[PDB]
Design a protein around this ligand. Structure first.
Ligand SMILES: CC1(NC(=O)O[C@@H]2CC[C@H](c3cc(NC(=O)CCc4cccnc4)n[nH]3)C2)CC1
Lengths: 274, 298
């Protein structure tokens, strides 16, 4: 189904079809680390969590992080046999490509080399960003996990105006659901489920299946397998509580929810294993 | 990166260094945008990464195609489809005799189709001007230069301010709106539409305030009735002079009744009321060019 209202600028079913048709172009592989036998799934969690903290220090948007995560996962699916010391360069260069794509005033190249504690040169990043974009066939416009949550939050708070392009939803509950998604993305087995399924399953845990289906278009049976897998991650967030909305210097409050945050979520990821 | 022989330099600007190349074996001609990577401290430019990724997913008959992206010798070559002339050079060559009305309608119809394809894919062009509209010798016209383009989300957020070349910049941009989307491209096409009719630019301003006053002098100084919320916009001033809206019989004399109606809806002050590209295709101005499809009531 399609949860978008009537769109004045295009056929509502045409815009939704294109968004769904793109998700078939961008492939995921929850077992791409079998192509890299020396790597372990936890190394990916430590890398992505480090990129989250880097994003918060430079106040990069959540969309920028999930672009880097998607660039990292799809690039490793094209490569074979990668060492641990090569992971930091691939991750920081994926964030460099993502920051230049998403931010209005992105950080400079030397700042991306600066946060690596001197382990990645500015020219090492330039070499890596070319290899990443060429290996991905320059397909660098995916619908991230966090971009779907933005769609689901807009339709949930829609009025009779049906103006789907002007944002209007509570920032408080948005960062709470994003907090659940930031934890689940550290686990590699999330790639089994499409990005749109993952976001709808996290919204369901903070609301209901009626609101989920109203704003995502997916029936309960489409997300049941994902909801059951997201079960341990949801309660870990419920046991510790929902985080508060942060204010960031230089970032307007009407955009403060879009800034990537970071907690010590690596401890919370291990509790979701049992 | 062989088999291609440079034939003529097309130009150098914000896009980059564009050459006209010709395949020696097949006789095929392309346009080569060359990017010297050794002179780019920040690696591949952000405008280059955006345009490549957007054009690799915007395959349409009215969009200049990106054919290949070759990287060699610290150079990044973008291979484009070649068209022999831009619209501005065509309008200048047609300034004396005028562009025939069936050709203006055919060109605007094709431009709206390419823009509707962009907006349905959630992509703003944000630099629609005659220099970026390319024509071939087979009656077609295509959108070019997506370096200033951006994919917008649903919902959108605050994007880059002061976009679009000044003559084709929508009034909501000039007044400093926080959010914007597809309406800014329609305003540009409305200016290009009238420019094809009158053979001169519609609002040729030399500053932000002069561009806004030229719009006010033709369409009238907007108020809360014609544009709700205009008096609260950041760059709005109560000291704006009060000009009366001019009769479109004088603004675009050659345009008939259906033409003035479509142009008015493309130049509506309110971005929420401004006609969309898809709806403009269904306007009675193109009722002789296109025929409607049956609509499933389900
Ligand atoms: C360059 C620009 N900006 C841009 O980004 O255009 C992209 C990049 C190159 C691609 C392109 C351009 C093109 N024809 C022309 O430019 C007409 C001018 C000319 C002059 C001499 C010999 N022949 C042709 N065919 N294909 C698409 C359009 C403004």
């Amino acid at each position: 189904g399609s949860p978008l209202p009537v769109l004045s600028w295009a056929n509502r079913e045409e815009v939704w079809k294109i968004m769904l048709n793109k998700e078939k172009t961008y492939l995921r592989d929850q077992h791409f680390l079998e192509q890299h036998p020396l790597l372990q799934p936890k190394m990916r969690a430590i890398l992505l969590d480090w990129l989250m903290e880097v994003c918060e220090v430079y106040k990069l948007h959540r969309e920028t992080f999930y672009l880097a995560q998607d660039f990292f996962d799809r690039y490793m699916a094209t490569q074979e046999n990668v060492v641990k010391t090569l992971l930091q360069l691939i991750g920081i260069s994926s964030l460099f490509i993502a920051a230049k794509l998403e931010e209005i005033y992105p950080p400079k190249l030397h700042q991306f080399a600066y946060v690596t504690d001197g382990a990645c040169s500015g020219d090492e990043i330039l070499t890596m960003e070319l290899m990443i974009m060429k290996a991905l066939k320059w397909r660098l416009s995916p619908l991230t996990i966090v971009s779907w949550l933005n769609v689901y939050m807009q339709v949930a708070y829609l009025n009779d105006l049906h103006e789907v392009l002007l944002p209007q939803y509570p920032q408080q509950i948005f960062i709470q659901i994003a907090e659940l998604l930031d934890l689940c993305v550290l686990d590699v087995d999330c790639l089994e489920f499409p990005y749109g399924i993952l976001a709808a399953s996290a919204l369901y845990h903070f609301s209901s299946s009626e609101l989920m289906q109203k704003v995502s278009g997916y029936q309960w049976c489409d997300i049941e397998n994902c909801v059951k897998w997201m079960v341990p991650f949801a309660m870990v967030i419920r046991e510790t509580g929902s985080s508060k909305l942060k204010h960031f210097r230089g970032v307007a409050d009407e955009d403060a929810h879009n800034i990537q945050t970071h907690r010590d979520s690596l401890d919370l990821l291990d509790k979701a294993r049992a | 990166m062989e088999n291609f022989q440079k034939v003529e330099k097309i130009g150098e600007g914000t896009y980059g260094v564009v050459y006209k190349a010709r395949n020696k074996l097949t006789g095929e001609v392309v346009a080569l945008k060359k990017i010297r990577l050794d002179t780019e401290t920040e690696g591949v430019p952000s405008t280059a990464i955006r345009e490549i990724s957007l054009l690799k997913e915007l395959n349409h008959p009215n969009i200049v195609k990106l054919l290949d992206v070759i990287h060699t010798e610290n150079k990044l070559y973008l291979v484009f489809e070649f068209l022999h002339q831009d619209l501005k050079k065509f309008m200048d060559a047609s300034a004396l005799t005028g562009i025939p009305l069936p050709l203006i309608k055919s060109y605007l119809f094709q431009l709206l189709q390419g823009l509707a394809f962009c907006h349905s894919h959630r992509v703003l062009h944000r630099d629609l001007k005659p220099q970026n509209l390319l024509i071939n010798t087979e009656g077609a016209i295509k959108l070019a230069d997506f370096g200033l383009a951006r994919a917008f989300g649903v919902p959108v957020r605050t994007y880059t301010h002061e976009v679009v070349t000044l003559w084709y910049r929508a009034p909501e941009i000039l007044l400093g709106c926080k959010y914007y989307s597809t309406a800014v491209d329609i305003w540009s096409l409305g200016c290009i539409f009238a420019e094809m009719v009158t053979r001169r630019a519609l609002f040729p301003g030399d500053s932000e305030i002069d561009q806004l006053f030229r719009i006010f002098r033709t369409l009238g100084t907007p108020d809360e009735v014609v544009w709700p919320g205009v008096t609260s916009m950041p760059d709005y001033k109560p000291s704006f002079p009060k000009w009366a809206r001019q009769d479109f019989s004088k603004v675009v004399p050659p345009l008939d009744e259906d033409g003035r109606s479509l142009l008015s809806q493309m130049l509506h002050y309110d971005p929420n009321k401004r006609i969309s590209a898809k709806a403009a295709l269904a306007h009675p101005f193109f009722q002789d060019v296109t025929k409607p499809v049956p609509h499933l009531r389900l």
